[PDB]
């Protein structure tokens, strides 16, 4: 009969740090009638070997706050992405309180709900469980503070052959506040270079290096010659450069004007993908690469862009204008275009009898001296991921964007103690993350680009509720606006 | 080291947009957009590298050079690295190798974003006048000290390192194919749809053991001999450096890295292989960097980015997050006589002036 | 400082991403600095 906590939502902007608190109201049903049950595709029909899965569904629910808009208002994101060149989550604080158990009775033909029972909760700080948070799943805390959300069920997967199990597979039987200190991770770079990697040169003075300009005097026979010239402002493609753009794994180019696209179903046949143990997984979103060459705004990589969807968009085969296809143009200066080849290489030795032949490079790994920009984080996009535990990794930052970590925030598992009896519980949830910032020091003379609301007169305000009370986010807000030298 | 330098007046003390459109912009690969500033800069970046104001007047038909004791010289270093960094591209303008020479200080310019010869909204214009700087008359001097960040020793002395193949050009012209393959047959990397030559490219031996004559088309830095012409000079007018020292741990520049199986053998299908024309990094590779030459650059600036691998620059030397800072310099404009009646327009009439001194 | 708790995003002064011959608030090919438009001071909002 005495409340166990208060309501905390606000943002304290202090110096180089930010503190964003968010509180929501939640409801936890009873999953699987309190039973751990095996699951596999054989329950769902098992059409393909690429879709094979094996694992267990558990009665426990878990809390997923891993998306940005949980912690940031549309205003707190604007204030952040305009004035800062970087941020990262120093600390985490999570409080869970005001537990209310409601038992349901069906008497005659009506259902009456009355108070009662315990609710078990624990966190895995030894990481002995699977980690299902960083996979971009649903069930994260709602953006708009007045929403009430339902806790997603916890279930996991493990080794499989077809739908059958194997001798090495594992079965885990899982049988309030805490604080968390993130491990050190590099600042997210929010900015779009004002230079391009090939144009770093001084346009006036010329290099002391030479290149081979002419291999023949002119049209005729036995005209072979070698003439060298200076690399300078006149021809800027051949100048000697120290650094070369980041790696690429090519994607197909799909055009939002449906007539441009080839008239055939190439969605899975033409999609780039990587094969693991016989199961072909689509490459999504893949390495960080710009979507389209400058001035091309109707072409997007087929599987390389985080594709959200608008409020009220169905699950299956929704129209093109019911989804929001993010733009990664910001990184075209240091990164190769996603729909383009990385370059060319020589395929043979020229000689008197053989012409010089070259061929395109459709994918390139890391080479010494490469630089690249990682993928941008979005208002709706994920925050952190768990770097899988392996003997090796390279540049662990996750491919969907955000902060790769080897000890991410622990999972929080919660269930209703079986008493069976129809039962559910409800309460409050608060999560407080202390963000650290990197201020914008630039000397640029002319004004930047900023994220601004638009002035056309309209019926609804963006990022606000309409006459039905339905909160809707009109467009993705990714953060690169401020510019910085290369 | 010490040298004697001379600083003219660039651009009539003006910032001026420059782009390919002033040069016509023939090819899309050579497109550029940027600015050109009156400031000059000191560049000592090459290995072999290791205040007096004057005015000019036209009197009758002859030009008389006089001292000017009251004029000043503005100099500043960028130690926060807020300007574009032009010292890393191996431009000319370095201190001369032989101290008895007197050198001219190159003009400062910087390039930024573009589409074609125009400028996109993201492109940013920097005004060097907006940095603080020290003003020096004929008795004042300027100095500062720098501290290099820790960089690995330069090495002068499991599977081999990566390769990106270069076309093979032979010094004897009879051997070379009788066609124009200078640009068409060259190894390139494409960025934003502008094909850019791969030069020098990763560190790779230039030729197999025993075949000294052949050289990679863009693999090795080429240095001109004393007095060599800017355009179309023969091969004996240039020095072509060879990397053959590193042939032990690195693949030859003109060779394929190796072979990989392209299919599964069976009773009905033969075992097939295919050539590896380029190989990225794999676990276990070891490789050598490119050697530095007495005429070669020392350092480069590692572009500020989320990530990079083995940042040591391709041309040579020591890659550094924070390199030695730029040093910018200009001669403060002294306006001529203004008209006795007020006119809001800025004064375009200045005294012809230059300065000289030591480094 | 603005302490406003307004939920939706403010209007901000932004330089439109544009493609043009010259860069706004910067020099042209002859070295003439130019200011394209008058700039107001009123963008953020507050309750009356």
């Amino acid at each position, epitope marked *: 009969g005495s409340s166990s906590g208060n309501w905390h939502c606000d943002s304290q902007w202090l110096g180089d740090r930010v503190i964003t608190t968010s509180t929501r109201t939640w409801a936890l049903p009873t999953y699987n009638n309190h039973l751990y049950k095996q699951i596999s595709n054989s329950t769902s029909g098992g059409s393909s070997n690429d879709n094979a899965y094996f694992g267990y569904s558990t009665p426990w629910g878990y809390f997923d706050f891993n998306r940005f808009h949980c912690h940031f208002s549309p205003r707190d994101w604007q204030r952040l992405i305009n004035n800062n060149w970087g941020f990262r989550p120093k600390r985490l604080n999570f409080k869970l309180f005001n537990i209310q158990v409601k038992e349901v009775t069906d008497n005659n033909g009506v259902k009456t709900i009355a108070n009662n029972s315990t609710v078990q909760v624990f966190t895995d700080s030894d990481y002995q469980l699977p980690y299902v948070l960083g996979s971009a799943h649903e069930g994260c805390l709602p953006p708009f503070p007045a929403d009430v959300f339902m806790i997603p069920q916890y279930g996991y997967l493990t080794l499989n052959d077809g739908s059958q199990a194997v001798g090495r597979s594992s079965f885990y039987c899982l049988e309030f506040q805490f604080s968390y200190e993130f491990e050190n991770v590099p600042f997210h770079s929010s900015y779009a270079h004002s230079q391009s990697l090939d144009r770093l040169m001084n346009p006036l003075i010329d290099q002391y290096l030479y290149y081979l300009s002419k291999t023949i005097n002119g049209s005729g026979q036995n005209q072979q010659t070698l003439k060298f010239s200076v690399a300078g402002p006149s021809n800027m493609a051949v100048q000697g450069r120290n650094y070369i753009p980041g790696p690429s794994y090519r994607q197909q180019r799909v055009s*939002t*004007t*449906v*007539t441009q696209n080839n008239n055939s179903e190439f969605a899975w046949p033409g999609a780039s993908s990587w094969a693991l143990n016989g199961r072909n997984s689509l490459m999504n979103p893949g390495p960080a690469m710009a*979507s*389209h060459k*400058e*001035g*091309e*705004d*109707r*072409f*997007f990589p087929l599987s390389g*862009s985080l594709i959200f969807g608008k409020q009220g968009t169905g699950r299956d085969n929704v*129209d*093109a*204008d019911k*989804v*929001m*296809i*993010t*733009n990664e*143009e910001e990184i075209k200066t240091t990164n190769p275009v996603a729909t383009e080849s990385y370059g060319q290489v020589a395929t043979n030795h020229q000689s008197a009898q053989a012409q010089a032949q070259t061929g395109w490079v459709q994918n390139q790994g890391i080479l010494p001296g490469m630089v690249w920009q990682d993928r941008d984080v979005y208002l709706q996009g994920p925050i952190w991921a768990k770097i899988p535990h392996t003997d090796g990794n390279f540049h662990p930052s996750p491919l969907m964007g955000g902060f790769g970590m080897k000890h991410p925030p622990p999972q929080i598992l919660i269930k209703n103690t079986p008493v069976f009896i129809t039962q559910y519980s409800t309460g409050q949830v608060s999560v407080e993350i202390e963000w650290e910032l990197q201020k914008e020091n630039s000397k640029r003379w002319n004004p930047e*680009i900023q994220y*601004t609301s*638009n*002035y*056309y*007169k*309209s*019926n609804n305000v963006e990022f606000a509720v309409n006459t039905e009370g339905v909160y809707s986010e009109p*467009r*993705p*807000i*990714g953060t690169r606006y401020l510019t910085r030298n290369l | 080291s010490t040298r004697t330098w001379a600083l003219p007046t660039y651009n009539n003390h003006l910032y001026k947009q420059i782009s390919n459109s002033t040069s016509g912009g023939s090819s899309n690969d050579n497109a550029y957009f940027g600015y050109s500033t009156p400031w000059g800069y000191f560049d000592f970046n090459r290995f072999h590298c290791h205040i007096q104001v004057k005015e000019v007047t036209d009197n009758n038909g002859v030009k008389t050079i006089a001292n000017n004791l009251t004029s000043t010289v503005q100099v500043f270093t960028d130690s926060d690295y807020q300007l574009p960094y032009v010292l890393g591209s191996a431009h000319e303008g370095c201190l001369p190798p032989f101290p008895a020479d007197v050198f001219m200080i190159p003009q400062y310019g910087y390039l930024t974003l573009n*589409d074609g010869s*125009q400028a996109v*909204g993201r492109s940013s214009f920097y005004c060097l006048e907006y940095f603080p700087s020290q003003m020096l008359r004929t008795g004042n001097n300027f100095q500062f000290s720098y501290e290099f960040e820790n960089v690995p020793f330069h090495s002068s002395y499991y599977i081999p390192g990566p390769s990106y193949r270069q076309q093979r050009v032979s010094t004897t012209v009879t051997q070379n194919n009788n066609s124009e393959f200078a640009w068409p047959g060259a190894s390139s990397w494409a960025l934003n749809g502008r094909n850019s030559l791969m030069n020098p490219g990763p560190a790779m031996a230039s030729h197999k053991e025993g075949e000294d004559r052949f050289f990679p088309l863009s693999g090795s830095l080429i240095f001109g001999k004393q007095g060599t012409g800017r355009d179309n000079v023969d091969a004996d007018k240039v020095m072509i450096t060879n990397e053959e020292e590193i042939k032990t741990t690195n693949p030859v520049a003109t060779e394929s890295y190796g072979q990989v199986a392209t299919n599964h053998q069976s009773a009905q299908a033969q075992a097939q292989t295919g050539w590896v024309q380029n190989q990225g990094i794999l676990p276990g590779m070891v490789w050598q960097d490119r050697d530095v030459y007495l005429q070669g650059p020392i350092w480069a600036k590692i572009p500020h980015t989320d990530g990079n691998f083995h940042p040591s620059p391709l041309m040579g030397g020591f890659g550094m997050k924070h390199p030695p800072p730029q040093i910018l310099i200009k001669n403060t404009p002294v306006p001529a006589d203004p008209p006795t009646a007020f006119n809001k327009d800025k004064l375009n009439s200045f005294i012809t002036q230059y300065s000289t001194g030591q480094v | 400082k603005e302490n406003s708790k307004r939920w939706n995003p403010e209007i901000q002064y*932004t330089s*439109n*991403y*544009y*493609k*043009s*011959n010259n860069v706004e608030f910067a020099v042209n090919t002859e070295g003439v600095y130019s200011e394209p438009r008058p700039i107001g001071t009123r963008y953020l909002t507050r309750n009356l």
Partner: antibody
Amino acid sequence: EVQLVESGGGLVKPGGSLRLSCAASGFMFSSYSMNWVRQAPGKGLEWVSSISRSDSYIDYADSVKGRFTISRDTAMNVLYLQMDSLRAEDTGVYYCARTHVFNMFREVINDDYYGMDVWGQGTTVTVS
Amino acid sequence: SALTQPASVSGSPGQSITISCTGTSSDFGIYNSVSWYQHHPGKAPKLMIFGVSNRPSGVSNRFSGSKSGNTASLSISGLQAEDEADYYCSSFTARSTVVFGGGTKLTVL
């Protein structure tokens, strides 16, 4: 004050060719899409062709496709519609409009269409 | 063509008026685009409505719009003699073309 003035309309026998120019003033001409529409005598507005911001995408109404070529010089802001192999249906009043986008920095690749923003008074092309 | 819009509508000063154009298949109002134009004879046409109902800076509040199902409609209120013009509706299409209705001449009495 943003203004677009059409020019070059006139009288040309069928089968002839007419070039129409649109002189843009007051705004950045290379940052916007630009497109031509046509009003036949005693009829409603009809659309002819279009040209994108970076000139990558040129579009044509089904009827005039192949007989017209739209292009902009861009040295000095102007727009050009090359009318070749004119018919009797090409009589009308040609307008020069620019699709209006409030923010030129796209946040998403598929952007909802907002329609034309600035129009010219149009020139009359007549065939006999 | 492709957008059916009535030949002419008329109203007395002060009275509201609903002009409505209909379209076929999916492409009608693809993305958000259903746009209403005001064409006075001999002068430049004006974009009264951009989007289903959003209206630009220049337009007066009197003009409004909505799209119900397959039908979009322009609603003029507080009618005046200066509102007499031709009114066209347009919608972007799937091939990146725009499609204008035949248009309604509104004669205020």
